A = this chain, B = another copy of it.
Amino acid sequence: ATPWSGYLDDVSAKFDTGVDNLQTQVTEALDKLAAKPSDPALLAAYQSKLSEYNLYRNAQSNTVKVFKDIDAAIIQNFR
């Protein structure tokens, strides 16, 4: 059936389903810019997508780390 998925997987995937298609949009913007690097409207378009992508990946991974640290501290008190 569907592959198994924990709690951290879900907290991660809430971003991949929140930013609807940014992962495609960035590759489209790069394929258009590489065609003619000297178009102001293309450079202006690409700057925004690249910045948004950067921030998205940062917020995702920092949140996964924080939850992994809240869990390990409880698991340690079982002993």
Q: Which residues of A contact B (CB under 8 A)?
A: 1-4, 6-9, 11-12, 14-15, 17-25, 30-31, 33-41, 43-44, 47-79
Q: Tell me the dominant secondary structure on chain A's binding face.
A: helix
A70-B40, A71-B38, A77-B61 known; A48 and B4 CB under 8 Å? no
**A-B residue pairs in contact (CB < 8 Å), sample of 28:** A1-B21, A3-B20, A4-B19, A4-B22, A4-B25, A6-B22, A6-B55, A8-B38, A8-B51, A11-B30, A12-B44, A15-B37, A37-B55, A38-B67, A40-B71, A43-B74, A48-B64, A50-B66, A53-B70, A55-B75, A58-B72, A58-B73, A58-B75, A59-B78, A62-B78, A62-B79, A65-B77, A77-B79
How far does the Cβ of A1 sit from chain B's closest Cβ, in whole Å? 5
